[PDB]
Write a protein that binds this ligand. Sequence first.
Ligand SMILES: CCNc1cc(F)cc2c1NC(=O)[C@@]2(CC)N1CCC[C@@H](NC(=O)C2CC3(C2)CN(C#N)C3)C1
Ligand SMILES: CCNc1cc(F)cc2c1NC(=O)[C@@]2(CC)N1CCC[C@@H](NC(=O)C2CC3(C2)CN(C#N)C3)C1
Ligand SMILES: CC(C)c1ccc(COc2ccc(CC(=O)NCCN)cc2Cl)cc1
Ligand SMILES: CC(C)c1ccc(COc2ccc(CC(=O)NCCN)cc2Cl)cc1
Lengths: 350, 350
Amino acid sequence: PKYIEHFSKFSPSPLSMKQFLDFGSSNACEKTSFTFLRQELPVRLANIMKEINLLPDRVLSTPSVQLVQSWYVQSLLDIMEFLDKDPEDHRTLSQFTDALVTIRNRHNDVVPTMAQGVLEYKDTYGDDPVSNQNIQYFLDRFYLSRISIRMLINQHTLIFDGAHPKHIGSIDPNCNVSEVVKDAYDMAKLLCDKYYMASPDLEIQEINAANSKQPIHMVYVPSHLYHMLFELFKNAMRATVESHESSLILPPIKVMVALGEEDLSIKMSDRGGGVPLRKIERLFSYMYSTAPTPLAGFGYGLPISRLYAKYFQGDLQLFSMEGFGTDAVIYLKALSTDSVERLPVYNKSA
Amino acid sequence: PKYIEHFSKFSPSPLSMKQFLDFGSSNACEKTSFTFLRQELPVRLANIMKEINLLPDRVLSTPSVQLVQSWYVQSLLDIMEFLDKDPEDHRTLSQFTDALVTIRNRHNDVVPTMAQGVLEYKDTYGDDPVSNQNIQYFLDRFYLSRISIRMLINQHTLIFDGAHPKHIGSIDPNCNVSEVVKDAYDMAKLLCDKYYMASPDLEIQEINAANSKQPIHMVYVPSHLYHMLFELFKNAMRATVESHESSLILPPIKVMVALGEEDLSIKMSDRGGGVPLRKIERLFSYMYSTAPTPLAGFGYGLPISRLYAKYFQGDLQLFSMEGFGTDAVIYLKALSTDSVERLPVYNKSA
Ligand SMILES: CCNc1cc(F)cc2c1NC(=O)[C@@]2(CC)N1CCC[C@@H](NC(=O)C2CC3(C2)CN(C#N)C3)C1
Ligand SMILES: CCNc1cc(F)cc2c1NC(=O)[C@@]2(CC)N1CCC[C@@H](NC(=O)C2CC3(C2)CN(C#N)C3)C1
Ligand SMILES: CC(C)c1ccc(COc2ccc(CC(=O)NCCN)cc2Cl)cc1
Ligand SMILES: CC(C)c1ccc(COc2ccc(CC(=O)NCCN)cc2Cl)cc1
């Protein structure tokens, strides 16, 4: 496919936080966002479509991968319509925003569509370790690519609608980390109360190393941070509740927010009994998380949460002590200059 | 080299804890240990010598690798003298024990000898990442092999000297984990007091999941557990002291000993300011730990401690929060049936 082949010759251009903040500082930069995205979105779509086509035929030919690939073919065609158009025509800009909303919605069902493909592979070819590794390699890259494409689209559509805001699209330049922790906790608690008629309490501490008195803020995408905390909270709560059937008191879930020179770290700690070290890694596996529903443990929340952390050069790690409980740490870049998109690239090595 | 070539055709035979306990249950099993070790020790020496010879000539030909390789050649010759000898002659057994003590001592200087080779490589060829990875791959395998050879020799010489003990050579079948934690702490404290005129206190908690009241015991090699805890304590203490120059009170170092169905986990926690996630892995690097001396931070204590944990199927992991402090977790098998030697093998894939 030459249209795919043309744009897949380009590498995606990762943006920093600063670069994102400049695009949406003004409404005058809408021409700049359009001429940039009408090139960069085809580049990122084509790069992931090229990788989809490297899949063995027994995966490529299944209905779910064909369905998803047909969406990416259509979204590419939608955008390379605007390549010749003139940026000075306001009807070209508004139709461009329109076409982005259509593309975003078209792809809204990708996560359970791919999971249906995983389920079929497990039943048609099996769940050996080499299959697990290849599913994991592919879906990590596919989903991280999709996160990055969605980020670009949100930044354009949220900013250029039609007038000097605090939030810049999906970026909050003064994100109060502890408030997002509490929001995600409250939401998980609401679900956990409905499921189990009980829920652990929350304790938050902050360590702002350089300024011990200042509440910890950062530049970040709070919906991503919410997503990660919410998924971790549901897990911590289920583990706490189900390991204390015989206890009257549930241990709280504790959160420590630490700000260092380079890292902003968020540790969540439960006393939910923990798991043996041998079983930690499978918790991040798409294959083992796919089955044919409890508060936590199934679906792709945990591995996708790790990709959100990785997207701006962070990480998400799990540490448990069997018989006691489990820690989860989200590591984020403390400095906006260090927060740069992490994109999968289609090099020959891949 | 055919003598090397003959024995390197065999794979090392990893032993379990149970198997070690049976060899030294009796004094009658000395014939059995001799006929076993006079085959198995050449197998393990030849396997590591074969790998030493796979090193590129610019590494192989340096004086320190030639020196170490000459020791392994001599130790192999010492043992394949006993291949024809008769196990029923007590003079054959006693001379065998004798020859093991000579072999163990001959190799006593390997760690700083290899480090001298690392230092020369860094100055003669450089410290690029690919060099780092190959040094790390080689030395992890070389040192783990050496730990296993030393384990076999200690079990023979400590048990068969010349009468129904609690300890079985270097194995304690009723190792009180918390007592070893305190021993290692006391020793590190002694050094830290001399260095800095101050030291953090120690707090220990135990979680024995199945039996909440019982002190936690396990079958293990307590000198190995001591080695690991001692190295971690020196690090935790230096970090605590040097991050609190302006404070009057030093935070304690906290230890949690947890016993689960499969894992026995030992978490050590300091408030020594922590390090950015990006710098954790280099703490395990032989290359970055080699320089041309503080309480902690130089030399190979940390990566060798991880190999001790790995030797009977455990692990040692570091988790830090920049601006606050650092956790270290030793993971050990809780069940003696699961505690099996982990040996490097000379497969074609290696
Ligand atoms: C402080 C943050 N706490 C935390 C965070 C986590 F992300 C995970 C956990 C915690 N605490 C936990 O105890 C853990 C595991 C470390 N636990 C939470 C409860 C759900 C449980 N999930 C399972 O058992 C799934 C594995 C299958 C279900 C998939 N099926 C197949 N095949 C079996 C994982
Ligand atoms: C609760 C257990 N605490 C713990 C355990 C650890 F194993 C390590 C640490 C801790 N706490 C710590 O803060 C840490 C790091 C996570 N820290 C201890 C103090 C010494 C410091 N070492 C360095 O800076 C070396 C790196 C070079 C010196 C090599 N040179 C080169 N090139 C620079 C490491
Ligand atoms: C549905 C999606 C998520 C999905 C489902 C299933 C898979 C599984 O993908 C595999 C499985 C095995 C191999 C080995 C192989 O054949 N190598 C090539 C040997 N010539 C390669 C791949 Cl890409 C991926 C993605
Ligand atoms: C002194 C000891 C510890 C030591 C010191 C230094 C080293 C470094 O070893 C290297 C360095 C680079 C390469 C790349 C290479 O040349 N590959 C082969 C390409 N044909 C291979 C090896 Cl085995 C090992 C062990």
